[PDB]
Design a protein around this nucleic acid. Structure first.
Lengths: 113, 276, 116, 269, 115, 115
RNA sequence: GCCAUGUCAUGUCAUGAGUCCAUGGCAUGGCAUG
RNA sequence: GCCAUGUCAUGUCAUGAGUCCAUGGCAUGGCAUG
């Protein structure tokens, strides 16, 4: 079989966290302008925050929030609303990056199998 | 070198590293004068005694020895913890290690004392023989007092050469010094999420505790009825348990079995430790 | 500006964000295996049935699909972000952020700060 | 020049000596970050934890601290024994002492931790509060890690200033010196085997009373001298010098010896 | 005047005084060997080195020198004093003291009996 | 040349030497009190009578007298010698030893090496 | 393991001028306080 | 007095997806080996 219970529960969990996490970031994070201003003046940053600047997580957050403010989100934005456009009776992709062309290309790669 | 296993065998040896040299004979001599030679001279004032034998120098030397080793391993292992740094340092400054270094230079044969060093019935032989270690430190002390500016670097380069083999042996073969970096600190948690529920009584057991002879541990991961889902071995119970967890996480048919088992059990019974 | 307790939540959120996508691409099939499973359910194990009713499995499958088509774009950059991070590269590691996109933003908080 | 009871009463103090500065802010921040703040963050790798809080810096600094003090006193007291040197050094690097230097700079108030430092019912309060000592050591390590070449001399100057009053206080708390030969001297003058001239320890030093009393006595119990000192040896020496000063007494026992047949004289009976 | 306790100390002091000078002249080299030893010290055995920082050896050598140079004066009779002693000679046996000098001191103490 | 065991004896002897002379000048009367005591022995403590029969007491008095008459010379020097010693002073502390005296001697040992 | 101060035992080497005595140094170990 | 490794108890703060559960951080102390 394809799907195993153990695989399913981890997937549901991962998708749930995935969405919850991107949301928290967009909620909490400033864009790169505030980030850059902080890193070029570190003497005015509170000390417990200084190590955060040596690590990747904050910049990535700022960069993501940036893409958001610039409306280049798209794949990530669709994800946050995906649950709400999900319907058991619509059988084809809710992501518009998957067009009807890509779909059959794949069906016959596992149909060759 | 050109390893002596290769075709030039009889070539002079690179070992031990060239000893830095004390230019003031007053000081060079004092290094080798033990107090048993001095404190019995009734015509000496206490002040004259202290300036004669090597104990002030041993004192100075022990510090520089300890300082330089500290910097050396600090810089060479940027990601070592303080406990790791401290444990490694113990290997470099120990009595045994310094003593061994001392014999390396035949300092023990140059040391002046008032009693028989070679007597094998002497009660000196059944001790720690710390005098040999002392004189080596005293040599370092001698070096500093002679020319503190020029000799501190030479002490640095000399000791780095002495330390390399000792470090290299200890990082590879010492258990406390091993690397914790591929451990998932969330493993026991991950496992409980996947298969865990209160009445399963999923617990870790220590089957072997670390001892002086055997500094390792074995922890079994078990359910209530005794079934072992994993085993792990490591420096302490924490690490061993983590590897036991990781062991269980790799057995996917088993995980799937227990996840389904959980799904079939009603929340409580499920949420109680003893459904009685 | 930046606050400590918010920073902790941010750093942690980002870590889960990445870990979660990695797990999805790791465990999930693409949309063809999803469709087959959702269309023959008497042949799938009984316990997975409610999950097939929900969005998570399909969304994971769609993402796994984009991965197989090499239309990932941004999501691959994110999973690669950590090992490409360097403190002395002060410019965006995401290439969708153009050096051009940056100033509408440098200046909108430039005008935003002066009504202040 | 602050008598502080003259005209200097409310005037600003030149104390503590000006702190050398860590120019790397990455490092300056870190000295003050305790581990309780770091190790509970589950999204950090062990490596990232170690490079975050101050434990590496405390380690390095503790070594430099001990190093610099050790040279300082080695040079300042060319005639000190190793025990004197070692004992003196204990006052300089001790927990209580480093703790004090730390508070002097308010490091205790700047230390970022995860729990309540001011809670007076907290169990942190009946322990050693070694953390306060640690943060001070960590400052030294930070200075060293930041710029080892330029900052080691600045540290020497600085620590020499901090150390000076503690030393002056320990060294005070000279006179005639002990004759290590006094007991011999006395036996030479009045001694013979049957006098059973011996020393008695009336008091052995204790933690409560770090002193000793030794009496010098002859066989019949007569005390010829009393001496008081740090240990039994010094006390005995001081008893002897006491006995050596009473010349009427010496002359008496010398005359007595001269009067005894060496037949009896040379026996303990 | 004289007390027993002072007397036993005096005999012992005098005895060793001469006994000490004897040992010195016997064992010590003169000042040139000292100078050679201090002016190298690399062929000087280590245990003898601290001795060069102290006064005893130099003074020991200097005296041995005065001896080889026969400027001993006062100290040779000291070594000779015992065999020159006789109880019935009431006159100073050291010739660095002449009986012009005694006069000065004798009338000096009737002077202090007048105090 | 110099041997370890001999050096310890010299150092020790030099020490006893100086300490002994010191003791003598401290404890002993000069020759006037000495003569007074020896000439009336019925009034001196009975135990010291043999000491009066020996030389030390007389030698001690003679030296003490020499001291009072400030004719000590060398002996005054010997007691001050340690206090005058400097390792960085490389020439003799005795004023009877002149750079005019130390020819005859260093050139005599340039004579002795070649035989 | 390691450190100081204090105290005690055993082995050993010295020192002292009445020595069948007296005083210390070292080495190895013990105990107490820190 | 103090150091490392190991192991345990009390208090406290976190983490986790089945939580009346599970796993850790710190602080204070106990015991073992070196």
């Amino acid at each position: 079989s394809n799907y195993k219970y153990l695989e399913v529960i981890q997937l549901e969990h991962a998708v749930t966290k995935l969405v919850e996490s991107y949301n928290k970031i967009i909620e909490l994070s400033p864009n790169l302008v505030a980030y850059n201003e902080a890193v070029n003046n570190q003497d005015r940053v509170p000390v417990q925050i200084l190590p955060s600047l040596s690590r990747y997580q904050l910049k990535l957050a700022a960069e993501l929030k940036t893409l958001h403010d610039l409306k280049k989100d798209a794949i990530l934005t669709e994800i946050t609303d995906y649950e709400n456009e999900f319907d058991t009776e619509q059988k084809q992709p809710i992501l518009q990056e998957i067009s009807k062309a890509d779909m059959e290309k794949l069906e016959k790669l596992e149909q060759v199998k | 070198y050109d390893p002596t296993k290769a075709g030039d065998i009889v070539k002079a040896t690179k070992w031990p590293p060239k000893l830095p040299e004390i230019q003031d004979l007053a000081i060079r001599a004092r290094v080798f004068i033990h107090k048993s030679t001095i404190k019995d001279k009734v015509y000496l004032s206490g002040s004259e005694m202290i300036n004669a034998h090597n104990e002030r120098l041993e004192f100075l030397g022990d510090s520089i020895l300890n300082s330089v080793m500290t910097l050396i391993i600090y810089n060479k292992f940027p990601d070592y913890s303080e406990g790791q740094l401290s444990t490694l340092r113990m290997n470099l400054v120990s009595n045994e290690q310094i003593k061994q270094w001392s014999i390396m230079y035949n300092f023990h044969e140059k040391l002046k004392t008032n009693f028989d060093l070679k007597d094998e019935n002497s009660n000196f032989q059944n001790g720690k023989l710390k005098l040999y270690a002392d004189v080596f430190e005293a040599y370092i002390g001698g070096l500093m007092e002679d020319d503190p500016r020029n000799n501190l670097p030479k002490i640095r380069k000399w000791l780095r050469k002495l330390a390399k083999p000792v470090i290299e042996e200890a990082t590879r073969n010492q258990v406390a010094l091993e690397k914790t970096d591929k451990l998932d600190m969330n493993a026991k948690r991950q496992l409980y999420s996947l298969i865990g529920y209160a009445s399963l009584r999923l617990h870790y057991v220590t089957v072997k505790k670390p001892t002086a002879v055997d500094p390792n541990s074995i922890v079994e991961c078990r359910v209530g009825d005794g079934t072992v889902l994993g085993t792990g071995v490591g420096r302490n119970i924490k690490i061993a348990g983590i590897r036991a967890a990781e062991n269980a996480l790799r057995d996917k048919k088993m995980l799937d079995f227990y996840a389904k088992q959980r799904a079939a059990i009603p929340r409580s019974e499920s949420v109680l430790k003893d459904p009685s």
